[PDB]
């Protein structure tokens, strides 16, 4: 390795196609120029578009993948014999200098392309850089975001849906054990891993995924598992007699020695402990499914409901109109930031909006647009059935500090804390909204007759990018449901 | 004798009062 590194860096004629300067091997330009030529079009640059699962085409981005694979495999051995004390530090310094090469994470981020090249990409980081520090793992937090999302969708015994590249994906995830050897915001990769064992497509490959879920909780905080334990307990109670024998292993690993200095609650552990007790006796005998189960205590929904024949009582007469006007005021503030002004004749070029007027004079189209989601939401939890309060002192509709007297003002209502029961109700409403989105996705998929989308997935599947929008919508729900003296609870 | 003037030492210990968390009391103390 030392000799080949010395000779290759003495004679770097492996030039790059786009970037200038002596040498080359600039992935940040070569990979990006090669994908636009290879993915949609054919092997040549000027060429028509054809080819599905096609694994100047397959040449350059495999030649590179081989090059960084060779560099990673010839990187000096780490943390077994040599740890910065064997004169081999100059080789690692040269490899890091070839920062530009630190952008291997950025290179792997461009997920649309053979899945096997990502194995070399992560192997380079394992060899020359290492993720032993928590900062890089906090930066990434996933082996691959879109690959993890896509492996969830590609799980079925179908011809055109899976069993085409999912095997290569499974091999790449088998390689992907970098997190092995204190979650800050929300690491939820074990929920993604839960889908893998539901239907074991690759035989014997679940052994590589067992420690990814096992050792994760040891590093993870007990409280960081919030409602994913509830979902997993639901699935475990459903499949208490199943080939998924890692459920009891996770049960033991959590319940035993999950009691830290905090000594967290066991009331939520009582809900599935009785289910496990009542489901362990009707089965007659398994040889190892009940051995370690000695101490279990310290001491997908596409259609939520149907509201075709639900009548809304007319207890909403004033606050609904007030909050519709508040939403219109927020829209007016947004269009004022855009540059729109009130006028008489609508004109897109001149940025004239004649709708800058009170809700009583507003148009029926925008009135229905503002009223339909709120009315549908109210109908939904009225259909579910919960109590409604009318507290007198909760009247915070108008308490914070142009033509027709239209003077909207910004209100900072995001500083208010809400209760856990109201949070659960808003989470149910958010699940209903996600199911509505899933319904529109199913309708458009049926209309198109073919396609796939990785957003037909539960809460924990969502990464931070979409979770930001989800939290913004949840905050809007909190703002709507925290005022007007109306309280909903069980 | 601040002739041709209203007051002096125009300054403020600024606290944003528009949020009104609990309708805070503001004034000098001894």
């Amino acid at each position: 390795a030392n000799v080949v590194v010395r000779l290759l860096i003495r004679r770097p004629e492996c030039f790059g196609p786009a970037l200038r300067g002596e040498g080359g091997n600039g992935l940040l330009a070569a990979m990006e120029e090669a994908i636009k030529i290879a993915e949609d079009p054919s092997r040549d640059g000027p060429s028509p578009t054809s080819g599905s699962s096609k694994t100047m085409g397959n040449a350059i981005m495999t030649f590179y993948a081989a090059l960084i694979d060779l560099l990673g495999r010839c990187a000096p051995e780490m943390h077994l014999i040599h740890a910065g004390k064997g004169e081999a530090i100059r080789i690692r310094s040269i490899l890091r200098s070839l920062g530009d090469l630190v952008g291997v994470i950025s290179i792997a981020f461009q997920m649309p392309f053979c899945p096997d090249h990502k194995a070399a990409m992560v192997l380079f980081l394992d060899r020359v850089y290492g993720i032993e520090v928590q900062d890089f793992l906090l930066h990434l937090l996933e082996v691959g975001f879109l690959p993890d999302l896509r492996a969830a969708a590609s799980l079925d015994t179908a011809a055109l849906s899976a069993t085409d590249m999912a095997l290569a994906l499974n091999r790449y995830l088998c390689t992907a054990v970098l997190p092995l050897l204190c979650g800050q915001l929300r690491p939820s990769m074990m929920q993604h891993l839960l889908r893998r064992l539901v239907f074991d497509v690759p035989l014997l490959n679940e052994h590589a995924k067992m420690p990814l879920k096992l050792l994760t909780n040891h590093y993870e905080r007990c409280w960081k598992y919030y409602c994913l334990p509830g979902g997993w307990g639901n699935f475990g109670a459903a499949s208490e007699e199943e080939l998924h024998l890692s459920r009891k292993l996770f049960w033991g690993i959590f319940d035993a020695l999950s009691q830290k200095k905090y000594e967290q609650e066991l009331f939520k552990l009582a809900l599935p402990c009785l289910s496990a007790v009542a489901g362990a006796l009707p089965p007659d005998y398994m040889e190892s499914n009940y051995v370690s189960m000695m101490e279990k205590q310290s001491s997908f929904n596409p259609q939520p409901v149907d509201t075709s024949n639900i009548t809304i009582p007319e207890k909403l007469e004033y606050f609904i109109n007030k909050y519709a006007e508040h939403s219109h005021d927020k829209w007016s503030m947004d269009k004022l930031a855009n540059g729109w002004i009130y006028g008489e004749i609508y004109s897109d070029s001149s940025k004239i909006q004649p709708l800058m007027k009170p809700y009583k004079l507003l148009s029926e189209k925008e009135k229905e647009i503002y009223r339909w989601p709120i009315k549908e939401s109210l109908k939904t939890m009225l259909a579910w059935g919960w109590r409604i309060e009318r507290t007198r002192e909760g009247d915070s509709m108008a308490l914070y500090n142009a033509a027709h007297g239209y003077s909207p003002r910004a209100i900072d209502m995001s500083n208010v804390t809400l209760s856990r029961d109201l949070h659960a109700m808003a989470e149910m409403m958010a699940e209903n909204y996600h199911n509505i989105w899933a319904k529109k996705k199913k309708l458009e998929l049926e209309s198109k007759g073919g396609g796939n989308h990785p957003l037909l997935v539960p809460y924990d599947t969502l990464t931070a990018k979409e979770k930001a929008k989800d939290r913004e919508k949840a905050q809007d729900i909190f703002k709507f449901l925290q005022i007007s003296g109306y309280v909903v609870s069980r | 004798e601040y002739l041709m003037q209203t007051s002096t030492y125009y300054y403020s210990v600024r606290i944003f009062p528009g949020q009104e968390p609990a309708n805070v009391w503001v004034g000098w103390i001894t």
């Binding site: 860096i9 003495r10 770097p12 300067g21 040498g23 040269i94 070839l98 530009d100 | -």
Partner: protein
């Protein structure tokens, strides 16, 4: 410094003068700190051999030119730019020489005025002459670039107070102790161009000093004939 235009644009050799301090072998990798002179003080005036590590000391500054780890050079994104540093500590401190071709070999004695190849012992890079924008830029790169040495002065000369070129001096009168002096103007505009004499306090001071140097690049710091 462009010394080719010797008749048109005169060069300066005080900043270009370089002195070799020590010559060790690459095999003789002495132990690091927490076991600077322990054993490398035997004899003196040791001859120089091919393949031995050498240390470049600048003439009027005690800084050493070796292996600057900076990425300020964006010409090719890879070649390091070499600078100057003080401490003779760390592996990125020494350069070793190599022959130009097979006509020499590693182990011989370097003759005067040969052709030399220099490599950083740390990054294994050579001195480079990349062109930024119609200009020269010293870089630590892996490309070939030949170099030559010209002996300016020797350390074995028994001068003990004789005249050697490159040394600043005073032209003074023996009897009246009078030396030349240039006046100072309002702010360096025109009044620095006049010449006059001045004795007494201004004798042993700054403004009455000039540098004497020979036009010849090779052996400029020689006895003046």
């Amino acid at each position: 410094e462009s010394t080719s235009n010797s008749k048109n644009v005169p060069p300066d050799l005080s900043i270009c003068t370089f002195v070799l301090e020590q010559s060790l072998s690459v095999r003789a990798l002495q132990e690091m700190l927490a076991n600077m002179m322990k054993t490398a003080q035997g004899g003196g005036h040791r001859t120089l051999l091919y393949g031995h590590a050498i240390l470049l000391r600048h003439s009027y500054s005690g800084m050493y030119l070796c292996c600057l780890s900076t990425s300020r050079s964006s010409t090719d994104k890879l070649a390091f730019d070499v600078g100057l540093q003080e401490d003779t500590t760390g592996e990125a401190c020494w350069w070793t020489i190599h022959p130009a071709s097979k006509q020499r070999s590693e182990g011989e004695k370097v003759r005067v005025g040969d052709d030399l190849i220099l490599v950083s012992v740390s990054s294994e890079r050579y001195l480079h002459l990349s062109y930024g924008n119609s200009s020269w830029h010293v870089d630590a790169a892996f490309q070939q670039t030949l170099w030559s040495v010209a002996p300016i002065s020797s350390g074995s000369e028994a001068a003990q107070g004789y005249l050697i070129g490159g040394d600043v001096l005073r032209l003074l009168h023996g009897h009246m102790d009078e030396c030349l002096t240039v006046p100072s103007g309002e702010h360096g505009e025109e009044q620095r161009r006049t010449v006059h004499y001045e004795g007494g306090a201004v004798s042993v001071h700054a403004r009455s000093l000039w540098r004497l140097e020979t036009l010849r690049v090779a052996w400029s710091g020689s006895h003046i004939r």
